[PDB]
Amino acid sequence: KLKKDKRREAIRQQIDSNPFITDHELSDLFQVSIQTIRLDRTYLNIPELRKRIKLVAEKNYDQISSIEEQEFIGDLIQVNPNVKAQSILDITSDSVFHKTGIARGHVLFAQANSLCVALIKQPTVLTHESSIQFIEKVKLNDTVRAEARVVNQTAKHYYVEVKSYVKHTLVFKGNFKMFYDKR
């Protein structure tokens, strides 16, 4: 009971620091079964990872004004408008070359491009220019986490840098010059 409570405190802290941590990762860290971790989360009222993602994205779509959920590519997991945003995208068979399992370049671009749009709190946002690098192959069943950050803003454009990752590996980089209008 006493070991459990200390572990449960430690799990609350893990989730606070890293909201999108998996049960497997938690199982490793605390040397208990995935079953124990689920039960721990249940006592703590912390939903399973996919539910946490759905819940937070729902809240995020409420904060943006430049693009609608139905047209957004991936799940918007973090947004600080005009500053920083992140999305995740699961790569399914619909997103790859079937023979190699390699993700299509337009898929990674769509995720990054959509994220730069959602990040900017303006009614009109249009991509003007983009420079991108496909650093490592993204594969079937990978989850891509894209991070976008505003690096400059003028009267007519936001300049945004995007870096996208599979686990800890940088797989894609893009610089986006985004046109906006307050009308």
Place this chain on the structure above:
Amino acid sequence: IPELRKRIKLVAEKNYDQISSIEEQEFIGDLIQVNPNVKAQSILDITSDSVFHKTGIARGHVLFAQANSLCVALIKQPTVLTHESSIQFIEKVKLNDTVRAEARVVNQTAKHYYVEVKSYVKHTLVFKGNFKMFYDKR
């Protein structure tokens, strides 16, 4: 000669027979010209699936997908992967537009083809991109 739409699909069909880097099901648009390692063209009908529904403006990843597939199809190598690309959205493409993309090889190294893409709606230049395409024979 069959109907206009049929003919285009047949020219596309016969064009996918001279390429080896990508297949019909994975190619965005219709491949209307291919001169391997030199030049290719494709056309793409912009339907409601490809636009922002509120404004009718084509999604940038759609125009990019056309241009990107076209560059792949152009290069007559077993392995072809986009390494880098730099693109410009010059004019809004709209619902019901047909975009004609033209890809031209401008340079070639041991490891990459450098390809320039220009996309048009009728006579208007709407999109431009430079694509650095990795290739391998093996």
